[PDB]
Amino acid sequence: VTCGQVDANLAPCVPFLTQGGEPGAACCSGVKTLNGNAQSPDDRKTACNCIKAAANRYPNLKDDAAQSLPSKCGISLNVPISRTINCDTI
């Protein structure tokens, strides 16, 4: 898992992450792609830290949209969607 793939798959989610509403088909497709390609614990930790880096690159979006993104796209995660989670301690 590389952070470039994370960014490419989450790029269609920026409109929903800034303007709310419902995540489109492309954003949910990217979310499910990322979820299905991060299988092993190391893959999931890598993807989590890539997502944290991306969130650092967007430091002015609040959390609620990203919190509702997994349920809206039909996935379930074992971590909260938060800037302050520690990815390497699960």
Ligand SMILES: CCCCCCCCCCCC(=O)O
């Ligand atoms: C936990 C390993 C990574 C699993 C992929 C989750 C898909 C991304 C969901 C959160 C996206 C975001 O809130 O920016």
Ligand SMILES: CCCCCCCCCCCC(=O)O
């Ligand atoms: C595995 C999903 C959790 C990913 C770690 C950080 C996710 C929250 C970061 C803030 C999301 C945002 O508002 O862009």
